[PDB]
Design a protein around this ligand. Structure first.
Ligand code: HEM
Ligand code: HEM
Ligand code: HEM
Ligand code: HEM
Lengths: 145, 139, 145, 139
């Protein structure tokens, strides 16, 4: 449910995203700011400090996949349900992640984009992305609905 | 709030300085554009870009946050009259305090490249939740 | 997404519902327990006490309509989106009620049913209804999605 | 918590008496059946009906709530060790405290016809939110 102007705002910024770094930057901040999400990443090892989390290679590798999923969603804003169906089954029926954490991860991502783009991440640009991350979270939670 | 959290919030935020009034105005606009449900609490504001009322109110919001960091160990008593206002007179939906807090973090991130570290980000989020908790404690 | 057993649990209990009273009993408790929802019912008059709210005729009359909407949803558990489309437009585009209050009203209703049916509102019976009220709230919030 | 809130919570709940252990077990089962995401915090429990472990744990939950009403004016210090447990060791998702609180209200409603008035319902919900706030204050 994006306008041409919001689509224009979202893709222009996304083209500048370092897809090898932004995913892990957001997953790490999630694990640091909302430390109960670490419950799902016991295997990742050292999450004992903020530095440990951010510099942890497993966090960076995984976030890259997460950002891979967001990129796919951006390319299918009109069928986010189908795009995230298998990820929904995984995160819902298998992992039992409360869907409120999807919203949090999405908002954390918004903070990462604001951090890296500064003035360029304008209030209108943010509004468009809040729609995007809301839709992803809702799609990823479809198996609860 | 841990001692490190307080250190970080005095830091992040010392750097906000005299922009604090302009940052709160930007936080509100971010909230109004991203979460339009919140605009119904300001039917009597002109919520357009550059509105003198949004600027004036953003300064009040930022000043209240300044007062909170200045009395971080006794925020319930410092924010006491604002708690009565937001809960009794305005009955603000508690959900809405999370929306404005998120926009306050976004605003800070976009204006403080160096300060918004993962740890400072975590501390600021704890600070704003405590303020939110206080402002919602009077229903 | 209800099973035959959950459908059986939900309709058997609903048939015993006093549809002239339960709606207003739940709307009233909403206005008392989450008093910021009164912001949307300034016209209703005296909401100054719990007794005032519950005994307020406007609250009872309106809750009857709300419970009317829930009954319709129960009869169309497989197309809740279409059922609540016009109510979604009203509560979303027009009233701007945050959808979190839909979840609250639904859970308040669950409490009212437990209050009136006691032991009969078993944990399995509750589980079925939590699915129902979740679906209603999600449907009523579709215009935000 | 207002003086009336405390009065109501001592009332509602005096009436729970020696059923308190059985009511907490029922609250958990209600939570496990209605919100299955919560069951992953008890992989080592047999969460079936009549489970000795759910009964035993429901008693601990109910006793902690008893201790909270008995120290309602100093709950942060009474619930201090439970706050560390739920946040540090168990990292309980804060969402989950709302789910169990709702099921605790449902359980009380279904067992206290006369006590669960609109006002008492409101007071009990404020009480459980304060307990939840305390148990989530240590992340
Ligand atoms: C909100 C948007 C999210 C997106 C787009 C996303 C995306 C992904 C992707 C692409 C994978 C890889 C699946 C595969 O390898 O086949 C994954 C796995 C995983 N996710 Fe997420 N995720 C999100 C939120 C979360 C949250 C909030 C948590 C926990 C708090 C979480 C926990 C996990 C875990 C534990 C795995 C590993 C599953 C396994 O390997 O068995 N995810 N996610
Ligand atoms: C950290 C969170 C917040 C802080 C520090 C804050 C602070 C303030 C302050 C200082 C005032 C002025 C009080 C006065 O001049 O007497 C105020 C008023 C007001 N606040 Fe907030 N507030 C917060 C959150 C919110 C939220 C989330 C909403 C709605 C979504 C909201 C809606 C309002 C409204 C409508 C007014 C009255 C404006 C007017 O009539 O001019 N506030 N707040
Ligand atoms: C969660 C399930 C809900 C259902 C099924 C529901 C149902 C209804 C129905 C059937 C009407 C009557 C519409 C008409 O007369 O054409 C209505 C109106 C209204 N509802 Fe709800 N409602 C829900 C939640 C809420 C909540 C949580 C609030 C506020 C906090 C709210 C506020 C209102 C208001 C203010 C009106 C009057 C609109 C008008 O007359 O212009 N509703 N609702
Ligand atoms: C009012 C809310 C709650 C109260 C009063 C409470 C109380 C307690 C108590 C007294 C214990 C036993 C501590 C000990 O024996 O050392 C405990 C442990 C535990 N709690 Fe809670 N709790 C609450 C909410 C929750 C929620 C919402 C969850 C998860 C969704 C949860 C999950 C657990 C788990 C997994 C344990 C450990 C059980 C075991 O290992 O035997 N608690 N809690």
């Amino acid at each position: 449910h994006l306008t041409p102007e919001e689509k224009s705002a979202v893709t222009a910024l996304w083209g500048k995203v370092n897809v090898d770094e932004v995913g892990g930057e957001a997953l790490g901040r999630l694990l640091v700011v909302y430390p109960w999400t670490q419950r799902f990443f016991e295997s990742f090892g050292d999450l004992s400090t903020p530095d440990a989390v951010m510099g942890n290679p497993k966090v960076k590798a995984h976030g890259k996949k997460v950002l891979g999923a967001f990129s796919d969603g951006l390319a299918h804003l009109d069928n986010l349900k189908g795009t995230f169906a298998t990820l929904s089954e995984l995160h819902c029926d298998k992992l039992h992640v409360d869907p409120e954490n999807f919203r949090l991860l999405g908002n954390v991502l918004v903070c990462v984009l604001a951090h890296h783009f500064g003035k360029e991440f304008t209030p209108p640009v943010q509004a468009a992305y809040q729609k995007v991350v809301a839709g992803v979270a809702n799609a990823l939670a479809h198996k609860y609905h | 709030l841990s001692p490190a959290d307080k250190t970080n919030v005095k830091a992040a935020w010392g750097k906000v300085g005299a922009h604090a009034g302009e940052y709160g105005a930007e936080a509100l606009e971010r909230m109004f554009l991203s979460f339009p449900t919140t605009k119904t609490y300001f039917p009597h504001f002109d919520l357009s870009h550059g509105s003198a009322q949004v600027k004036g109110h953003g300064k009040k919001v930022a000043d209240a946050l300044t007062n909170a960091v200045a009395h971080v160990d006794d925020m319930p008593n410092a924010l006491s009259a604002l708690s009565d206002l937001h809960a009794h007179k305005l009955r603000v939906d508690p959900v809405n305090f999370k929306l404005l807090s998120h926009c306050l973090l976004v605003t800070l991130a976009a204006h403080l490249p160096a300060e918004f570290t993962p740890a400072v980000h975590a501390s600021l989020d704890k600070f704003l939740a405590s303020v939110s908790t206080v402002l919602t404690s009077k229903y």
